[PDB]
């Protein structure tokens, strides 16, 4: 609860990298738990935990979008403290997000149903931490998009 030292690790599975969930080992924590990762006195990032057997104990695995947003480094030392969301105040009502393709090789002009986009975003990221300005990768119609959180309500 007070916070424990941890070593940043590589994301174990690409599917969880797409899910943009903080992947940890079974012994470190339990799947679905919410944590705050302290990288410096001024750098605290709220993540959602998703345990996997392949993660070595004592290490916290991060995906590339997470490292980009938080400026993490493979093998970097951090602190992790368990936290519980205040659903009475912190429940998200609306999410206005800006989306920019991560890959420029396969940029397309195909139309996308934004309703299905929102539905899949909620389904994949239900009960997960999101903050203004956060960056992640979202898979829709098997296409990767770079989502940058703009406004929350």
């Amino acid at each position: 609860m007070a916070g424990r030292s941890m070593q940043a690790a590589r994301c174990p599975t690409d599917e969880l990298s797409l899910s943009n969930c903080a992947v940890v080992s079974e012994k470190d924590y339990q799947s679905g738990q919410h944590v705050i990762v302290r990288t410096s006195p001024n750098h605290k990032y709220i993540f959602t935990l998703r345990t996997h057997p392949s993660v070595v104990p004592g290490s916290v695995a991060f995906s590339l979008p997470q490292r980009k947003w938080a400026g993490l480094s493979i093998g970097q030392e951090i602190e992790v403290a368990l936290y519980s969301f205040d659903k009475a105040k912190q429940c998200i009502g609306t999410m206005t997000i800006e989306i920019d393709f991560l890959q420029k090789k396969n940029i397309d002009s195909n139309p996308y149903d934004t309703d299905k986009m929102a539905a899949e975003f909620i389904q994949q990221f239900n009960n997960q931490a999101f903050s203004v300005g956060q960056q992640l990768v979202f898979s829709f119609n098997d296409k990767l998009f770079g989502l940058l959180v703009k406004d929350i309500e």
């Binding site: 480094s73 093998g75 970097q76 030392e77």
Partner: protein
């Protein structure tokens, strides 16, 4: 070369005469003539036997009621053995140091400690023992507030620790010395070198925290930016962040073009770049 034979003959004759006189109040004259015989043998350039005779005369003086003369003879015998069996010099200088500390003479005791450490590390291969001697001398100088000698001992032990892969001790010593220099009105400019050395020690441990270390060095001492050491450090950081061989090679060539790098610095840089 008849001179060496003549000096040997004269020294052995004087030693034999001293033995005859002592064999025949008598202790003082015996010790004096034995010291003269040891000096003559030393001039004869037979280093091992000259040192043996000098140490025997020193022990005979110890038999007499005298301390300062005994300690002087012991240190001279240690110097004579310097060019002979190092163990005998080590024992004689250890006994001299014990006597000196018995009388409270810190300066000569610490000088003898440094001398024995130096002879052990230059001639023999066991440098770790010399590390203990250097640390003892540094502690004695700190007790005596001898800033120069203590700083020299700390720098030497930190350098040997860095050479022996004791990165943390070297980095701590360098940081402490640099902070002490900066606090004083003078020597603050040399602090840059200590920071650079300390940063190398840290960088060899890892590359991720090298950014934190360089940030600390920059913000703590903003003027450190003007030093080309910080420029080389950031260049090395950006070079090693990616698996590109040309970057660090051209960086080291550019830095070496100005001034030659020392052996320790060159080997440390090559080690860090390779791994």
């Amino acid at each position: 070369g008849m001179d060496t034979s003549g000096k040997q003959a004269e020294a052995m004759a004087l030693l034999a005469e001293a033995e005859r006189k002592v064999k025949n109040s008598k202790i003082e004259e015996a010790c004096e003539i034995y010291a003269r015989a040891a000096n003559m043998f030393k001039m004869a350039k037979n280093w091992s036997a000259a040192g043996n005779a000098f140490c025997q005369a020193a022990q005979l003086h110890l038999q007499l009621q005298s301390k300062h003369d005994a300690a002087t003879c012991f240190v001279d015998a240690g110097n004579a053995f310097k060019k002979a069996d190092p163990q005998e010099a080590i024992n004689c200088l250890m006994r001299a140091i014990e006597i000196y500390t018995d009388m409270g003479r810190f300066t000569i005791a610490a000088k003898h400690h440094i001398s024995i450490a130096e002879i052990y590390e230059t001639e023999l291969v066991d440098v770790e023992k010399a590390i203990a001697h250097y640390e003892q001398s540094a502690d004695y100088y700190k007790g005596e507030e001898s800033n120069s000698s203590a700083n020299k001992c700390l720098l030497k032990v930190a350098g040997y620790a860095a050479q022996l892969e004791q990165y943390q001790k070297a980095i701590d010593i360098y940081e402490q010395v640099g902070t002490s220099a900066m606090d004083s009105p003078l020597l603050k400019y040399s602090a840059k070198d200590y920071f650079f050395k300390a940063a190398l020690c840290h960088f060899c441990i890892d590359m991720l925290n090298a950014k934190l270390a360089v940030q600390k060095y920059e913000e703590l001492f903003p003027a450190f930016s003007d030093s080309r050491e910080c420029k080389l450090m950031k260049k090395l950081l950006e070079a090693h962040e990616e698996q590109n061989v040309d970057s660090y090679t051209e960086s080291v060539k550019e830095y070496d073009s100005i001034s030659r790098l020392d052996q320790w610095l060159t080997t440390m840089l090559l080690r860090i770049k390779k791994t």
